[PDB]
Symmetry: C2
Subunit: 209 residues, 2 copies
């Protein structure tokens, strides 16, 4: 946090859902000039950790609290959440959105994804669900969905290969698809030379993410 210091350490706090997908790509593409300390957070911890200096950077989503001065940002990528479920052995979904009280696998209420998903379901009264499994961990939700336990909204980058080989099947590609946008956030304050170098390089590899 505050007292911890090295010449090369970059302190990153990342929302649970993009930690796995985002961080390895950044490490691989970044110049060999940094060391990394990464902690997973809920989106509501982000403001305080940036203001108090416990994190140099936040990897998170759209956040109106963080999308104003004295914060700065770069949009890293955009994605789409699809409702998916396991297959039925014949290349068809095991579940339907129209089943009364279908089993839902969802993020926690404290999550950015969970908030958008419930907003969506509310708008759509022709769907009724029972929540079978709640977890902040995207990869846990994905595995429980792959094991056939219910329907889950998951981001495209996490399920890309499972959609291609059909271990997961997309159940809707219109009004139930949820847009999401990933950002890196910082304080406007000028930082150390190494953190400024990290920020500059991050801008330069954003295209390749």
């Amino acid at each position: 946090g505050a007292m911890d210091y090295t010449l090369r350490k970059i302190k990153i706090a990342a929302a649970h859902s993009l930690s796995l997908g985002l961080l390895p790509t950044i490490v691989k593409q970044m110049p060999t000039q940094f060391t990394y300390a990464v902690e997973a957070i809920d989106v509501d911890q982000a403001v305080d950790m940036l203001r108090e200096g416990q994190s140099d950077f936040i990897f998170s989503y759209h956040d109106e609290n963080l999308q104003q001065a004295p914060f700065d940002n770069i949009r890293l990528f955009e994605s789409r959440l699809f409702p998916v479920c396991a297959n039925n052995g014949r290349g068809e979904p095991r579940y339907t959105l129209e089943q009364p009280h279908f089993p839902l696998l969802n993020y926690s209420q404290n999550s950015y994804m969970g908030r958008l998903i419930n907003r969506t379901l509310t708008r759509h009264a022709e769907l009724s669900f029972s929540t079978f499994f709640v977890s902040s961990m995207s990869e846990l939700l994905k595995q429980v969905a792959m094991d056939g336990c219910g329907i889950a909204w998951l981001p495209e980058y996490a399920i890309r290969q499972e959609i291609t080989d059909g271990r997961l099947i997309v159940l809707d590609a219109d009004e139930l698809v949820i847009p999401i946008q990933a950002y890196a956030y910082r304080m406007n304050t000028r930082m150390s030379q190494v953190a400024e170098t990290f920020w500059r390089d991050l801008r330069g590899l954003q295209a390749a993410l």
Copy 2:
């Protein structure tokens, strides 16, 4: 937490490193009588969440604070941490433990795994390391190791397939192997009928974990 209640909800707090490996197996083998709320925690949050009723059960490791009355436990499985790294293209490790200041990929100090690993390295003065990447997330450490960025101590269950096809290579199988033991913890207090049914069924599938 406390006020949240349904007839079937089982509230579980799990240490970061066994959440992915353990939880899907439990859901799959358990009778279809439960719903799940799972949150990831650091091991030091476990005592307070059990005493205050925010969690029914804790999935964690050996914890002397939790291995005494009024707590109860069942050992779920034991495993072994191996130092591993990516291959060098010829079926050999890319890194050696004997390289001066080899790049270490480690858990945070707040983690059970991190504590045992540093205890081990300290005992072994013929090794010197520089910490390249720190994260609580086992799956992030595994991916960074697979991408060739350094040496990491990882549990056998998480790297089993990568060891078999040689995307990760074990660097030591004697004095650097670290034993670990996974437990489920509860309060001694008698709980609701549904939580007692969950506890009884958990005992019954422990063999198959």
